[PDB]
């Protein structure tokens with residue numbers, strides 16, 4: 001399994017664009033695509049995972065472990081007192097947990113557990129972060145940089161600190177890779193913090209339905225329209241692939257053939 005590094009401390013728009021491109025190209029199936037949009041692999045393709053190393057301005061890092069089939073963050077590691085400290089979500093199966101241990105921290109004599117004692121659903125992360133909606137957790141490059149430093153090499157931190165980091169990182173890494181729209185929100189706001197708008201949230205929550213709708217579309221027409229939100233919180237009834245393709249970075253894996261095109 002490969003590691004993609006993003007230097008948050010020295011980030012520029014172009015370096016984030018390159019990061020997104022690299023992450024999409026490592027995660028995607030080598031071949032699968034629908035309507036020109038690359039698709040993630042089935043859950044049997046190896047390697048099953050990708051690592052994403054995030055570097056702060058002090059050169060400390062956190063490495064996220066992502067599942068290729070759905071781009072979920074499974075856990076993260078940091079160097080702590082010389083040790084590979086691995087932090088696994090509590091919703092990972094026994095067999096995948098072994099893989100997380102061994103992928104984040106391959107040397108079994110130099111590693112140390114520090115569990116994430118909660119699941120990785122946004123509802124849970126929001127709860128831990130003290131917010132009723134992740135619209136209330138700002139995203140941004142300086143925020144990500146700061147949050148890495150609250151955790152990496154730090155003996156103890158609160159669940160709120162951890163959940164904030166995870167909400168920021170999940171959205172700026174996995175959601176941005178899945179959605180060019182979200183990558184572009186980061187780029188448009190590159191020099192500042194921002195709050196995810198209703199379209200960011202609607203895309204995040206509907207990626208599986210969107211991916212299925214694109215995979216199933218015939219001659220560019222969705223079989224069933226899909227109702228999303230625009231950035232101004234008005235309904236967006238998507239009728240055609242060409243309406244939503246610009247916002248897409250990766251499709252969730254969907255079995256069967258599609259117009260590739």
Ligand SMILES: Nc1ncnc2[nH]cnc12
Pocket residue numbers: 071072073074120121122170174175
């Ligand atoms: N752990 C995770 N990783 C990626 N996307 C997510 N969406 C919700 N939780 C997530």
